[PDB]
Design a protein around this ligand. Sequence first.
Ligand SMILES: NC(=O)c1ccc[n+]([C@@H]2O[C@H](COP(=O)([O-])OP(=O)(O)OC[C@H]3O[C@@H](n4cnc5c(N)ncnc54)[C@H](OP(=O)(O)O)[C@@H]3O)[C@@H](O)[C@H]2O)c1
Ligand SMILES: NC(=O)c1ccc[n+]([C@@H]2O[C@H](COP(=O)([O-])OP(=O)(O)OC[C@H]3O[C@@H](n4cnc5c(N)ncnc54)[C@H](OP(=O)(O)O)[C@@H]3O)[C@@H](O)[C@H]2O)c1
Ligand SMILES: NC(=O)c1ccc[n+]([C@@H]2O[C@H](COP(=O)([O-])OP(=O)(O)OC[C@H]3O[C@@H](n4cnc5c(N)ncnc54)[C@H](OP(=O)(O)O)[C@@H]3O)[C@@H](O)[C@H]2O)c1
Ligand SMILES: NC(=O)c1ccc[n+]([C@@H]2O[C@H](COP(=O)([O-])OP(=O)(O)OC[C@H]3O[C@@H](n4cnc5c(N)ncnc54)[C@H](OP(=O)(O)O)[C@@H]3O)[C@@H](O)[C@H]2O)c1
Lengths: 333, 335, 336, 334
Amino acid sequence: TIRVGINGFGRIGRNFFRAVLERSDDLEVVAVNDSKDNKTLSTLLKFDSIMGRLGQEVEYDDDSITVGGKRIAVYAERDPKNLDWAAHNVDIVIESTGFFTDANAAKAHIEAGAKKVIISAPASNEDATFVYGVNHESYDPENHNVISGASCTTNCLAPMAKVLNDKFGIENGLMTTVHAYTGDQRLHDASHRDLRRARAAAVNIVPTSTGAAKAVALVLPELKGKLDGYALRVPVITGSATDLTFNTKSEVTVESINAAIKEAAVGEFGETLAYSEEPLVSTDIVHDSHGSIFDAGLTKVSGNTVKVVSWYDNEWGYTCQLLRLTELVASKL
Amino acid sequence: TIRVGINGFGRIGRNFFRAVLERSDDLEVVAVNDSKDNKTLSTLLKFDSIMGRLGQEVEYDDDSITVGGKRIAVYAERDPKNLDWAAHNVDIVIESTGFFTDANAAKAHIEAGAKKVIISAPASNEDATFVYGVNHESYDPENHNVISGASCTTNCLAPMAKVLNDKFGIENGLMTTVHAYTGDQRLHDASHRDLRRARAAAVNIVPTSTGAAKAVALVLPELKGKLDGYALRVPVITGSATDLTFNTKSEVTVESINAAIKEAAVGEFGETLAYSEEPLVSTDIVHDSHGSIFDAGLTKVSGNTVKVVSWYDNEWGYTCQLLRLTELVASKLLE
Amino acid sequence: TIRVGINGFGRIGRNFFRAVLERSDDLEVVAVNDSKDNKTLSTLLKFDSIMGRLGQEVEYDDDSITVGGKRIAVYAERDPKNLDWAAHNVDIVIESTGFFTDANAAKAHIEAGAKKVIISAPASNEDATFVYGVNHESYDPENHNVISGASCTTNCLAPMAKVLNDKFGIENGLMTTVHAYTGDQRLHDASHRDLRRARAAAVNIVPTSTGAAKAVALVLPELKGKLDGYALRVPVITGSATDLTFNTKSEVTVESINAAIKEAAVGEFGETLAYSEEPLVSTDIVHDSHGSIFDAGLTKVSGNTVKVVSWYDNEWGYTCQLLRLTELVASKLLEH
Amino acid sequence: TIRVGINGFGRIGRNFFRAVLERSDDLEVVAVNDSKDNKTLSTLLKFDSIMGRLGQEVEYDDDSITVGGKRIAVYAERDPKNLDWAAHNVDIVIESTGFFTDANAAKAHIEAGAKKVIISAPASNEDATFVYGVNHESYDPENHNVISGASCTTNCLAPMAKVLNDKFGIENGLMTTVHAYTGDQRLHDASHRDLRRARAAAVNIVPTSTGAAKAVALVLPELKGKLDGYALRVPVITGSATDLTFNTKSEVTVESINAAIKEAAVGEFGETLAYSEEPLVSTDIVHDSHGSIFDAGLTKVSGNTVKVVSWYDNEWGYTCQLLRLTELVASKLL
Ligand SMILES: NC(=O)c1ccc[n+]([C@@H]2O[C@H](COP(=O)([O-])OP(=O)(O)OC[C@H]3O[C@@H](n4cnc5c(N)ncnc54)[C@H](OP(=O)(O)O)[C@@H]3O)[C@@H](O)[C@H]2O)c1
Ligand SMILES: NC(=O)c1ccc[n+]([C@@H]2O[C@H](COP(=O)([O-])OP(=O)(O)OC[C@H]3O[C@@H](n4cnc5c(N)ncnc54)[C@H](OP(=O)(O)O)[C@@H]3O)[C@@H](O)[C@H]2O)c1
Ligand SMILES: NC(=O)c1ccc[n+]([C@@H]2O[C@H](COP(=O)([O-])OP(=O)(O)OC[C@H]3O[C@@H](n4cnc5c(N)ncnc54)[C@H](OP(=O)(O)O)[C@@H]3O)[C@@H](O)[C@H]2O)c1
Ligand SMILES: NC(=O)c1ccc[n+]([C@@H]2O[C@H](COP(=O)([O-])OP(=O)(O)OC[C@H]3O[C@@H](n4cnc5c(N)ncnc54)[C@H](OP(=O)(O)O)[C@@H]3O)[C@@H](O)[C@H]2O)c1
């Protein structure tokens, strides 16, 4: 029973609350902070447009919600300086507001009396970034305190990149992620700092930038400077694909590329990276707990140019990787 | 030329801008206020996910945008007290932020120099509310200075209700509007004061309240207390339909209900209310300039109970109604 | 264990299959007939854009599919005369192709050795039409052999109409169903006998006819001649609502209308009709097993005119109703 | 006025009809053949979920439609051998059913009195295949009678690939086209020879195959065997992007890739290929008349690996390409 807190009970925060419920034997969410009133908060817990109804009952009052007869403290402090985790013996705070991805801002959780902070996103000034199944062994139970669990796309790309580079070496690579729309995008054409994301999300293919390809280097140093890419946001509510095209010096074939993924995708790592030969479409990978679902039927090769494609549920898959990482932290003060 | 300012360059503000280019010979938009920087504003004006590309070159600088060679002063004041419409000799302000539907607040525009204010929405404390085609002949240029052009749904409902009440007598009625999603709804399940409008707009049927059927009484006072209804937000980006079930003492048939609309839907009034026997779906009424398109194929009659359905592009149709009102105001004394 | 065949392994057929696995102790689907090859048939069982992945393993060979170890025999006969259900000991056939809603055509399943046929749609020339929870107690094991489970919309409307008519009396009413798009509609503007259903389904509000308001008269003959209505197909893949506006002679309030549903919506009937005060949107009723989910928050009253709204998952809720009817047929005399 | 018949009055057929009215001074559609009855056909001409309402009045009866006072003969022959284009003095037939992309089937239109046939798709056994702006100068009026206008995707990729191959040299490249759903796909999970295209089109990203990149070789033989790729079908109703990642021996920068397109995208060729630095999304390119709209803002370079992205309205863009080709045919012998 390692006692967990959630800062920012949004898509990832609520996906995380459910993942813990359905997957963890040893964690407990005992406090959450969120800018929403508790009626809204509990409604959005009980009903979900993507995951469906929560298995259990939810009640609320002015400073709590109660899920399956278990009382949870709730705060509404839009600056985490004004919080007090310590008061609920809270060991870890998932930082999923998306506004405290700077560790200098996030560490504030520690100041409020937390031991760990896992930011549910690419970060800055953090102690360490991890994609579970890729670089989790270099967690430092003593020094690694404010950390990143990286991005959905990085948790898709890195597993697959690592294997294929470990095997054939990647010289250069460029990625397109065709990605479900997310909450930062606008429903109607409206204000946004990014002039494409300003555009009505559910009727547009929307190009946008992503650090996810560069960010791979945070977990695979050997690929620094070797990878870049961008995203096409498309009208599905969840479910995404990472399409990577790359150059190798090795002689390769489709078969050899596919057999390497297949070979590697077993055991504990297989809980992160899956190998498929199924006729998949995006709805088939909704609620899939892998970080990366390699699609063997999409593999292409001309000369020493290779295209490979991997799926991920950007909500649920990512969240399952964030739970793995959290179990690790939780197993070692 | 009558000079117009727009406060709130959003969906309705930008439809209104284009409507003026496309349909007015005597209005010109000379200043706009909005919270966006001018690079953002000009981009959203040039490119539109519903109306397509503006047919004119657009440039911007620190103080302005220029559209087909005409400079438009641009401000970014959250508080309208800080505007200066008089500097631009603006006659009429379209209030389309959604934040100043109280006339006690919208009157700031008048104090900042405007002569008239038309709120793009149900208002309070307003001098008068109008649905063009229904009650605009009661516009009073000396006493009606801050006015409402009502809601999209009311502009769809009121014309059809006037005809049917005038010819048959509506005793009682309940409406459902099946309505395109709008910008306040959430893309992903997230915080909202309305617990249903919180839910991912583009994958849900979302019920929501609307005063639109009660508000008909503002323009047809003979129907106070007689109409109510509600909305179902559905996944289309624009285009809507109003479904009205009502009772009459008159003896009626599908045919006589339909003839009653066809008879009335001519001349000037027919620019507000259309009569159709076409096999319409919502994309067919996208960029229709009527406030109300009556679908004769959907009329049903059971005893003394009648169901009628009228379409409306809640963006462009409503805007064209607002533009009709605007032209009326501009045609008369602005003193 | 009563053994079941499905003719038409489409949206309803495959929902019905999953409903049996998940909800039934005493039925088993052992044979299916469809137009698809076994690879295609198994792919579409295994993977589902709405229901997600089957939680059983699916394999195939060239005369069968295997699901959690159970061999299901597979046919691809366009003409049901050419089937043989008796070779599989099938007592009941679900007729879910959409092409054999005439009971004179569907009776070919009985010629081919079945005992009972349940058409998953409005039918013609049928022995009897049922909405489970409304008129199923009139099922006659000897003489009701080829029957209808009526439509999705009828299974939403009838339970609500029965309670309100029993309590207050319904003089007249007109219905609008706001309904998920269905396989009859076109993805792109293209040929259809219905010129509105011809139009790209996922970008349009599409008006179309519905027989649900006549059909309620079949299971509730007190409402003969009293109801009419239509449908608006909208861009959701499943999930629908029935909006009924009616006149009553009773003096009624929002509260008394709601209380009547809440009072009725209990026990076994409560598995057909639920009563809700939740802030529902369509996704919230996806995979709900009720035929009808009354939304108390949408009730309106103007004098003696009432507007009520009930939800339904037109795929899964209807299928659960159809399963309830199947369980009843299966619980009685299948013989003659 | 050169007189045009349309076989297959579908999405492409009706796009073409409207493209002639809006864009041609010298072509007239005088006859159409389709499976539909005239009520249905006239309705789908008048009303379009993508294009909006036709500007002109539309009437029909048992053997015709009338558009803007112009009478169009209508037929419903499943088999093109039973047609008589000669009886309407038709010179060119647009073959847009999707069923006669084999030239040996499409030549039935010539037996039936047409002089030229333009297949609105990749063909087999055709006299020649053209991407207007890339290879149309090789059109041979005497020998090229049953021709192909290639695919939407090839019309997007080939102009871009020609420019970039000319300037820098393409060793190999692999394409992903993120494409609008099309009529071949299913609305609900349902029968289909392609187990991905079986899946409900408007709620899925759907991978499927395409010969569009190999087919570039037909108009640019120098790229034979150098390109392949596939499609992801996504839930927009029209509007697509071609994403090409390729290898060059050249040392290249983002700026020099972009500059190469900009320099090329001028004059007549620039009606086929546009250069843009705008913050484009798919709805911006709906009803765009170009075959290819190069998005300069998405170009990336890593070492010797280059990624470029061009937009296309797979309906109207393609159709405008197909009309350009048609205009060329109309302007030479027969
Ligand atoms: N969705 C994805 O696919 C995905 C995948 C991987 C990672 N992520 C990352 O995870 C993070 C969360 O994203 P999301 O999609 O869950 O977004 P979201 O639904 O908008 O979640 C953020 C939640 O925190 C609340 N919040 C905002 N500011 C707060 C504050 N100062 N104090 C407390 N609560 C506050 C939010 O806003 P209100 O409650 O004020 O509206 C909301 O409930 C982001 O960094 C995102 O990039 C997202
Ligand atoms: N859309 C419809 O179907 C419809 C139909 C009929 C009537 N209406 C009514 O028309 C009004 C506008 O609706 P809409 O859909 O056009 O909404 P919208 O697109 O959100 O328009 C609002 C615009 O006003 C700006 N704004 C907000 N607060 C402001 C302030 N204090 N000062 C200046 N500009 C400000 C917004 O910028 P930021 O977003 O950057 O703040 C945005 O550009 C509402 O009253 C609505 O009910 C809408
Ligand atoms: N979807 C709903 O919400 C809903 C709700 C209630 C009731 N219903 C009713 O249920 C029935 C089926 O609807 P649905 O949505 O499931 O349609 P669907 O998905 O089209 O299913 C029909 C199935 O029957 C197959 N089929 C067609 N003709 C056949 C034949 N002669 N022999 C064997 N198989 C044949 C089809 O294969 P092919 O596609 O390859 O022809 C398909 O797999 C209809 O009567 C419909 O009204 C549907
Ligand atoms: N849509 C695109 O984005 C696109 C882009 C470039 C090229 N293309 C190509 O253009 C062609 C047509 O595609 P589309 O999207 O327009 O498909 P579509 O909308 O289905 O058009 C086909 C039309 O042909 C009719 N038809 C079918 N068989 C016929 C026959 N034997 N004789 C006469 N008419 C017949 C169909 O009527 P029924 O439906 O009643 O059978 C329909 O009206 C295909 O080769 C496609 O590959 C399409």
